Design a protein around this ligand. Structure first.
Ligand SMILES: [Zn+2]
Lengths: 99, 213, 19, 134, 82, 58
RNA sequence: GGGGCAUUCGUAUUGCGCCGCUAGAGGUGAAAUUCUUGGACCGGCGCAAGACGGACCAGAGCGAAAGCAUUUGCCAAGAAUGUUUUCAUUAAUCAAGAACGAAAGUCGGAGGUUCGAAGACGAUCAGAUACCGUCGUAGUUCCGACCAUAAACGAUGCCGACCGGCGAUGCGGCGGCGUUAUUCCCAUGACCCGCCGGGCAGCUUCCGGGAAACCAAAGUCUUUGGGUUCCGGGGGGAGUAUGGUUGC
């Protein structure tokens, strides 16, 4: 039976979407379906920031950040536990988790 | 068994007259063995230095690539080779609900340096805008691209490196594009993303020394 | 067995039959 | 070595290439051409497992700092590098430990930046169409 | 719902509803007379017009062809006819 | 460089059979120096550890 | 991001020349095969090759469907909207007969960067003819011939009418306070609030259906007839046998 109305992807009123490569296991996945995780993480973790402050020659030097957009296939997205299965009612909810 | 670092001479490297902070730092090279001169080792040497390390009170995300041209008795003579933008800035600029506009142009300076200038721009979220997206239509983009191309052309065709660098220190090119392209579609951040030296003239010491004083 | 491999066996059998 | 005033900090450039198989802490001059000292996890630990371990990275950065003190360099410009290309963009586990170990040795921290080789429309990645099944 | 006089809809609702889907069809367009600033002769133009029209009186452009209604030149005053 | 460290708070219990415990320790030589460490055996607030390797993380 | 032809740029990958320091580097759950003091891996400068157009990139657009994202120019298409323009039934759907048709595949030419069927090894294993790793032929790319198939899917034929609401969104048009840029007045852009038509969709609903899952169509079906094409008749045998026809 039809599990997901959208067929677990975003392509509507469109023929074919170009494929991309899963950041983990290098699987070929369509761009629309792929789980996209755009992570903006500080170049140093808060635990190690203290040691950089004193050592730095510059005063009030704002620290750089890494911007990297990870693409996950459904096999790897579920195994890595970034996304897990939900109830048949809570599936239709497409609101991102609040933090 | 010999330590090579015993046979290394440290040469001080100075930036040309465009920048305030003259002293950049020290580079070591192997001593002249007779066959090959120490100057030849320092001749084709590049230096990617932040703008805030060249000018005292200027921003620190517009990195300047400086090539050595001559060596003058312990002191190294550098000239402009290119202008790069730092990664974190370039990554922090690109947002998911706005059109990015990129325009590259080849221009010949009057004194005879061939530059390739890449200028990038982003559409502005208005202050009272409810709509989620702020995209520009293909013609509006083409008009903006033509506008920033012809501005870059005009403003770097007429003058020479001496003046072009001084124009790029505050990024006056960008500010003028932001002001000019406001009417077609409001721009958010318009920087000169990249400047690359393509071709050089036949080297002479006189102009290189004039660039330093 | 798998239907795609039923079809591949059938084609291998048709190749040897005709020759 | 360099005849410089005690107050002024002599700068260098430290390239930190942090893969998942190994870590590279490599100090050079301002240009990059004239290298000073490079040490990798392989030289510290004799275990192919722990080539990339944070401990190996810490030891590598501690030894390269110890050598840099004796050549007159006091400050370093950090350049963090992941494998990049068609492979992963995230740095390996050694990066943070190595940077901490350089900062702890007494070496000053200059401009921090990522120099990961990001590709615009690259060639086929090493994995097949179905990808890596392990 | 359930009681509307399909026979006698209110004239503001009549005008809002599409020209073809009205109770009786009527065009949204109209005929207007133009008074050119540098001329005495009067001319009549269609509200949505398609050709750049010329006043042979002074030989000057009047209205411009657009996606919808024709934009009149600055100075030339338009007035509705009947 | 063998240095001592006070225990301010017990963060939680870790390890495959919860045999270890994760704690945040404030050093003795420096007053305001916090680091996260995993320690075997029973611990509480006030207990001082003798850290042989003071650079590693948990 | 409809199509063809031309032009240009981007970093990355790989190979090569030169320079610095050097003992390991690669890969894996763990290893080994493999490349290394005839100087690997790493860092700097420059040259070359072919591939691909990241992030922007969306339940967004365009196309009959396959499919279609670097810039600029040239050539001819096309929907929708706008119209007090014209022809005046010229239409709908379709045996025969046509155009196109992913990937792979077969012929000739060009070139071979990456990846990589076959094959050669190294691991794991009771065995592994596989999964994992190192290499690698055909192929992957371009020009000219074929081949006519995919879960070619919305598993849902096309044309036309009627039947509930709601907020967005894309293109065009229409009306209207107020912000801003082109100094200012209009007038164009960017916003903002409504309306109208045609599209991509979404949420809600005891309209009503259905075996239900669900569907504003898969509703207006025993209260059974708007028009028309293809097509199923318990499960295997079987998309097999034979015959015809198309193709190297
Ligand atoms: Zn995967």
């Amino acid at each position: 039976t039809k599990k997901r109305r959208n067929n677990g992807r975003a392509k509507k009123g469109r023929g074919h979407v170009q494929p991309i490569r899963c950041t983990n296991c290098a699987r070929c996945v369509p761009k629309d379906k792929a789980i996209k995780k755009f992570v903006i993480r500080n170049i140093v973790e808060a635990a190690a920031v203290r040691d950089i402050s004193e050592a730095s020659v510059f005063d009030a030097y704002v620290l750089p950040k890494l911007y990297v957009k990870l693409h996950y296939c459904v096999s790897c997205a579920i195994h890595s536990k970034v996304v897990r299965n939900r109830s048949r009612e809570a599936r239709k909810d497409r609101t991102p988790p609040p933090r | 068994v010999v330590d090579p670092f015993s046979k290394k001479d440290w040469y001080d490297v100075k930036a040309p007259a465009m920048f305030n902070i003259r002293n950049i730092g020290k580079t070591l090279v192997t001593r002249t063995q007779g066959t090959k001169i120490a100057s030849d080792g320092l001749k084709g040497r590049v230096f990617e230095v932040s703008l805030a390390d060249l000018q005292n009170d200027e921003v620190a995300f517009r990195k300047f690539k400086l090539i050595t041209e001559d060596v003058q008795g312990k002191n190294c003579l550098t000239n402009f080779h290119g202008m790069d933008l730092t990664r974190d800035k370039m990554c922090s600029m690109v947002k998911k609900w706005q059109t990015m506009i990129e325009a590259h142009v080849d221009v010949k300076t009057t004194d005879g340096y061939l530059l390739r200038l890449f200028c990038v721009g982003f559409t502005k979220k208005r202050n009272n805008q409810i709509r989620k997206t702020s995209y520009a239509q293909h013609q509006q983009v083409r008009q903006i691209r033509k506008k920033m191309m012809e501005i870059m052309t005009r403003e770097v065709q007429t003058n020479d490196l001496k003046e072009v660098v001084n124009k790029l220190i505050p990024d006056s090119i960008g500010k003028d594009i932001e002001k000019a392209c406001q009417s077609i579609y409001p721009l958010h951040d318009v920087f000169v993303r990249k400047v690359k030296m393509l071709k050089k003239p036949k080297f002479e010491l006189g102009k290189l020394m004039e660039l330093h004083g | 067995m798998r239907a795609k491999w039923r079809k591949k066996r059938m084609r291998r059998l048709k190749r040897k039959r005709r020759k | 070595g360099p005849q410089v005033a005690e107050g002024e900090n002599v700068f260098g450039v430290c390239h930190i290439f942090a893969s998942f198989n190994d870590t590279f802490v490599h100090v050079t001059d301002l240009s990059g051409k004239e290298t000073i000292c490079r040490v990798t996890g392989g030289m510290k630990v004799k275990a192919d497992r722990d080539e990339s371990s944070p401990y190996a990275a810490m030891l590598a950065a501690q030894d390269v700092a110890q050598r840099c003190k004796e050549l007159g360099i006091t400050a370093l410009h950090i350049k963090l590098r992941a494998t990049g290309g068609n492979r992963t963009k995230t740095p390996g586990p050694g990066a943070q430990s190595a940077l901490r170990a350089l900062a702890r040795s007494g070496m000053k921290i200059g401009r921090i930046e990522d120099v990961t080789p990001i590709p615009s429309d690259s060639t086929r990645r090493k994995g097949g169409r179905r990808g890596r099944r392990l | 719902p359930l009681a509307k006089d399909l026979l006698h809809p209110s004239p503001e609702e009549e005008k809002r509803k599409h020209k073809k889907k009205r109770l009786v069809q009527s065009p949204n367009s109209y005929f207007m007379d133009v008074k050119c600033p540098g001329c005495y002769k009067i001319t009549t133009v269609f509200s949505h017009a398609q050709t750049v029209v010329l006043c042979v009186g002074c030989s000057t452009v009047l209205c411009q062809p657009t996606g919808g209604k024709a934009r009149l030149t600055e100075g030339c005053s338009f007035r509705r006819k009947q | 460089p063998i240095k001592l460290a006070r225990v301010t708070k017990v963060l939680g219990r870790t390890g495959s059979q919860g045999q270890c415990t994760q704690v945040r320790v404030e050093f003795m030589d420096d007053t305001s120096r916090s680091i996260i460490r995993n320690v075997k055996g029973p611990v509480r607030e006030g207990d001082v550890l003798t850290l042989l390797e003071s650079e590693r993380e948990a």
